[PDB]
Design a binder for this molecule. Structure first.
Ligand SMILES: O=S1(=O)O[C@@H]2[C@H](O)[C@@H](O)[C@H](O)[C@@H](CO)[C@@H]2O1
Ligand SMILES: O=C([O-])C(=O)[O-]
Length: 780
């Protein structure tokens, strides 16, 4: 039994006093509030908030039985007796406390009937997690397939169909019960740590995510090369083998930006060497030459590092001596048995651990390393009596990887202020995106079920801040012989998800260049397609940096007033315009795609479909997976290159999908130098926009460029605009008032400026796109 006693308004925050203690409410923006219970006491600081000490002016009003604390869109309604806070956007009930806070740490809230709940991060349980209970304790799930209540990267956060996000801003071993134990109760609990939650509201799912990333952090734009092709396996055993793999990509004509080196770079065996963090010179004898030779071919090098230093490693004595390791309660270095052997964990929460670890990254980055892979940051083993500078293992567990990322991000920005850090990690916390974390879904089995779970995993992480969530393409764990069909399907899906990184245990090849002729004839043009689509992908990335909009969006974005779509985890949006339906079983002959009402085109075949609600049945083939294009889409391409180091947009090819049903459409292409962390902030970019206006007798395109440009930017781009489903009635074209006749023959066979292909229903326009506005008008 809890009740209101008294309140103060101080430094813009409302401090309430109950019979059981102090509660501090600070608005972190107009649509986001931090509620800290036990505000009187010493607690761990926030990990989730990008600006933990901010509070914006709010309107407090008092009545008899209630208080009302309001920012712009979000209102906290604080009932006095019994004490219960509830949350409103306008006068719509988002979320009400039941008992609220208790003692362990425990928060309890009501769930409205029919409310659907996404969240928890990586779980394979269904998209609506209501009716489920699971732990908040990051932990490996080696060889998972079609089920998991607990894996590498949990998030103490949910997204509701009421269009709010709730963050349990707590790093400790805990649990989430989403109306499982009691129908109508959401319960959050932890063993220790901060007793705080954060509620964020939105008018729509895009605005919600914008609001969320506003307060938890925005991903800075990764380097363009992160959207390229990675060569990876576990693992290249030598410099010779790694040079041969870069060579194989060249001699097989597959694009390649980055080669990833697994744990054999620092020692000849899986066991016994972890913590060396230095080249195994018997197997990598000339690594500066190696990395420089690769950079001559436009190829970057990424190295795996782990949080553990083994007692058998070259660096044990030094790490002990520097006080870099986490300690036991006696106060000496804590050592424990890992798979790899006996060892300690680097204390990234301490000054001495951070400096020691940072110095090692600095030395290797100076040698040529372009990016970093941080593996096992759950941490994979983490005994409860391990003591970090700010708390014990069970208190800090779910923030270890988060702090590892922050440490490494700050370090890379300090060493290379003109480059974008590349940081790939397995485990983090809410807001780790603000440190550039690129997560992957761990050690997935080489099974169809492993593939069939990846969309669910990607969407759950994308919705809560992680745009670059991806999988080990082809599958990682076990298997004895390649499942060729599953592999092909996985690398096809690969094209339409955030990072193109095939990776697996090296008894079966993960790289597409090591596959048979049929497999390479299928995948080679799709990996080239990935490169041709870089303007589309990089523009989605730019939008993610601006607004948190993820690259993969769920089907439920298409209709916010149909909550039944929340369950779908087989069809998703890649950017604004493509609905992708991966094939997740062997031998599937056709698919039923639940395309939103409107007009859609087969991406591969140009076929036009219209639907008023009913699904579309498409046949399948081995060469592709089913992709529909939304009418009104602008799909931009550039010619395929071997490496994004050679990237050029001097030649653009843009495909517009016309339909009279879409009378107004827009597209955007974001260009910059692909490497500068300050390009957006300083406006050192070239933002191309395209607007189509489609009426009964006219189709009109308005083209423009904004931004201050960048070094090497083309002043003029050769542009081919291909209009799919173009009317055969268009008589003439004006380009900036200059009339041009539309040829009706020989389009593929003449240097035609405007030509209609009657057999394909495509109108092709070729022109020069310079810095000034350009208007193209077609009239009947
Ligand atoms: O248990 S593993 O086989 O899976 C772990 C990682 O998640 C993989 O990405 C990595 O390639 C392996 C070697 O460093 C690790 O051992
Ligand atoms: O829709 C049009 O404009 C047509 O097909 O003629």
């Amino acid at each position: 039994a809890v009740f209101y006693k008294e309140h103060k308004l101080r430094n813009d925050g409302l401090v309430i006093t109950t019979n059981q203690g102090n509660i501090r409410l600070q608005f972190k923006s107009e649509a986001a509030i931090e509620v800290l219970y036990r505000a009187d006491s010493k607690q761990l600081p926030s990990f989730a908030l990008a600006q933990p000490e901010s509070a914006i002016k709010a309107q407090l009003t008092e009545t008899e039985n209630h208080l009302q604390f309001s920012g712009g869109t979000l209102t906290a309604r604080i009932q006095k007796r019994p004490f219960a806070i509830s949350y409103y956007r306008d006068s719509e009930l988002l979320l009400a406390e039941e008992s609220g806070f208790q003692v362990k740490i425990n928060f309890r809230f009501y769930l409205s009937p029919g409310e659907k709940i996404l969240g928890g991060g990586q779980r394979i349980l269904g998209m609506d997690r209501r009716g489920q209970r699971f732990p908040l304790y990051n932990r490996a799930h080696y060889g998972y397939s079609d089920h998991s209540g607990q894996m590498y990267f949990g998030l103490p956060a949910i997204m509701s169909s009421k269009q709010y996000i709730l963050v349990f801003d707590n790093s400790a071993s805990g649990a989430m019960d989403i109306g499982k134990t009691e129908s109508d109760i959401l319960q959050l609990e932890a063993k220790s740590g901060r007793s705080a939650y954060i509620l964020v509201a939105g008018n729509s799912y895009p605005s919600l995510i914008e609001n969320f990333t506003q307060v938890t952090g925005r991903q800075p734009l990764p380097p363009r090369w992160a959207l390229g092709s990675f060569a990876s396996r576990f693992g290249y055993r030598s410099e010779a083998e790694t040079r041969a793999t870069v060579q194989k990509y060249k001699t097989e004509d597959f694009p390649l930006d980055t080669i990833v080196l697994d744990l054999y770079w620092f020692g000849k065996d899986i066991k016994g060497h972890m913590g060396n963090l230095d080249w195994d010179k018997e197997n990598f004898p000339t690594p500066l030459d190696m990395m420089a030779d690769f950079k001559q071919q436009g190829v970057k090098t990424v190295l795996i590092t782990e949080p553990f230093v083994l007692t058998s490693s070259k660096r044990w004595d030094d790490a002990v001596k520097a006080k870099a390791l986490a300690k036991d309660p006696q106060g000496q270095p804590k050592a424990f048995e890992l798979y790899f052997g006996n060892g300690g964990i680097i204390d990234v929460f301490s000054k001495e651990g951070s400096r020691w670890f940072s110095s090692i990254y600095k030395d290797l980055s100076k040698q040529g390393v372009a990016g970093w892979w941080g593996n096992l940051g759950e941490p994979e083993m983490h005994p409860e009596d391990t003591q970090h500078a700010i708390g014990d293992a069970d208190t800090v567990h779910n923030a270890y990887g988060h702090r590892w990322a922050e440490m490494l991000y700050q370090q890379q920005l300090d060493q290379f202020p003109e480059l974008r850090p590349f940081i790939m990690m397995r485990a983090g916390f809410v807001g780790s995106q603000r440190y550039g974390m690129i997560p992957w879904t761990g050690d997935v089995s080489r099974t169809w079920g492993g593939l069939a779970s990846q969309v669910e995993l990607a969407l759950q992480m994308s919705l809560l801040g992680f745009g670059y969530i991806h999988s080990d393409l082809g599958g990682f764990a076990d298997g004895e012989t390649l499942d060729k069909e599953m592999y092909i399907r996985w690398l096809q899906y690969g094209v339409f998800q955030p990072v193109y990184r095939p990776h697996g245990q090296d008894h079966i090849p993960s790289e597409p260049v090591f596959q048979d002729e049929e497999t390479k004839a299928i995948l080679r043009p799709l990996v080239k397609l990935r490169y041709r689509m870089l303007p589309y992908i990089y523009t989605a990335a730019y939008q993610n940096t601006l607004t948190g909009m993820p690259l993969m969006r769920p089907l439920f974005f298409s209709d916010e007033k149909n909550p039944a779509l929340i369950d779908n985890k087989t069809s998703y949006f890649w950017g604004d315009s493509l609905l992708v339906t991966p094939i997740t079983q062997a031998g599937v002959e056709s698919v039923s795609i639940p395309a939103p009402k409107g007009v859609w085109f087969d991406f591969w075949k140009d076929t036009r479909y219209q639907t008023d609600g009913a699904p579309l049945t498409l046949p399948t083939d081995l060469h592709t997976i089913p992709v529909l294009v939304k009418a009104g889409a602008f799909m931009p391409y550039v010619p395929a290159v071997s490496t994004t180091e050679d990237y050029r947009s001097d030649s653009l090819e843009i495909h517009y999908y016309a339909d009279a049903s879409v009378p107004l459409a827009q597209g955007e292409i974001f260009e910059d130098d692909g490497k500068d962390p300050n390009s957006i902030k300083r406006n050192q970019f070239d933002l191309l926009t395209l607007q189509a206006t489609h009426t009964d007798n006219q189709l009109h395109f308005q083209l423009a460029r904004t931004g201050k440009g960048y070094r090497g930017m083309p002043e003029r781009r050769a542009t081919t605009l291909v209009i799919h489903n173009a009317s055969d009635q268009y008589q003439h074209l004006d380009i900036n008032g200059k009339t041009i006749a539309i040829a009706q023959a020989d389009c593929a066979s003449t240097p035609a400026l405007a030509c209609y292909d009657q057999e394909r229903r495509q109108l092709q326009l070729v022109f020069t796109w310079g810095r000034e506005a350009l208007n193209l008008r077609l009239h009947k």
